[PDB]
Each structure stands twice: as structure tokens, then as C-alpha cells.
Subunit: 105 residues, 2 copies
């Protein structure tokens, strides 16, 4: 139909409003997460702690996987997602350390 | 110090509580986002719409970049993050279409 075509484009539009809202929300939460991990980066750099903390990484992954299963959410994708975030964090930790070091030199 | 060592481990622990909370939150929001994009996948598959919708992708990226700058959040990372999500979504759209098609065959 044309009534049916519009019904379908209207549903699509409605679902995309929601997605678009989720994406803003996700960015605001990640903004705060990165405020925290940057406070960790400064602390690690001042006191010579390493960017990659394997016991920490391992815990975060097992925990998020368990919580993902409990939410009926794919645990492999939860892990892929967390690892994506952690790679940026590890980069940021290294950038803060190089910048604390260039002051010291 | 040992007082100073514990102060620092205590700060680190406190920041990690927050991170860990943000990560659960992020998973719950993504759970809902994927409920929506899966409803889009079914709709696209029933009515023969393609997985990759370039005009849609382009809008989502420009919009999230602008909103990221307005939140003092790195627009390149916002884009990297959205593209990471969209790659999963496009996969999921293709999986739904293959599964609607195998019923039809």
C-alpha cells in the first residue's frame, strides 16, 4: 500500500528516534567513564603504575560477561565492547604518562 | 607512605567502583538499543530494505559528532564508537535476512 508504505516508514522513524536517544545517552555515560579513567591515568602516572593491569582487565571482563548473561545480552559482544573501550583507555593512560614524563624532562 | 599507599589504593578502588557501574549501565542501554535495531532488522527483511543505509549512517555520525563536541567529548572517538556499534547492527540485519530467507526456501 501507500497507507502500508507510510505505516512502515513511520515505524522505522519511530524506532530510529529511540536509537538516536540511546546513542546520546551512551555518549553522556561514556563521558563520565572517561573522566574516571583519566583520573586513574593521572594516578597511575604519578605513582608509576602500568597502563595494562591484567588482573583488573580479567575481572572487568568476567563480571560484565556474567551480568550480560543475566540481562539476556550476548556475553561475547559485551566482551568485544568492553575491550574496545579498554583499548582507548590504555592509549589514554600511556598519553598521560608520556605527558607527565616530558614535564619531568 | 603506608598511609599514602593505602590512600592511593583506596582512591583507585573508588574510581573503579564508578567505572564498573557505568559499564553495567552501558550494557543495559545497549540491550535496549539492540532490541530496537533488531525490530528494524525484521522490518527491513520483510520489505526487502538493505542492511547498509548510507544516508541514515551519515546522519547518525554527523549528529553524534556535533553532540559529542557540545558535551566536550572527542568527536572522533564518538564516531569510532558509533561505527563499532553499526558494524554489529549491520551483521545482525544480515543474519535476520538470511533467516527470513531460509524460511521462504
Amino acid at each position: 500500500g501507500s497507507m502500508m508504505q507510510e505505516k512502515i516508514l513511520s515505524e522505522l522513524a519511530y524506532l530510529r528516534q529511540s536509537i538516536d536517544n540511546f546513542d546520546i545517552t551512551l555518549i553522556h555515560i561514556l563521558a563520565e567513564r572517561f573522566r574516571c579513567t583519566q583520573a586513574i591515568g593521572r594516578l597511575k602516572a604519578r605513582y608509576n603504575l602500568p597502563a595494562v593491569d591484567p588482573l583488573r582487565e580479567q575481572y572487568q571482563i568476567k563480571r560484565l560477561r556474567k551480568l550480560a548473561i543475566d540481562t539476556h545480552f550476548d556475553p561475547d559482544f559485551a566482551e568485544k565492547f568492553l575491550k574496545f573501550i579498554i583499548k582507548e583507555v590504555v592509549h589514554q593512560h600511556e598519553v598521560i604518562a608520556e605527558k607527565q614524563k616530558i614535564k619531568k624532562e
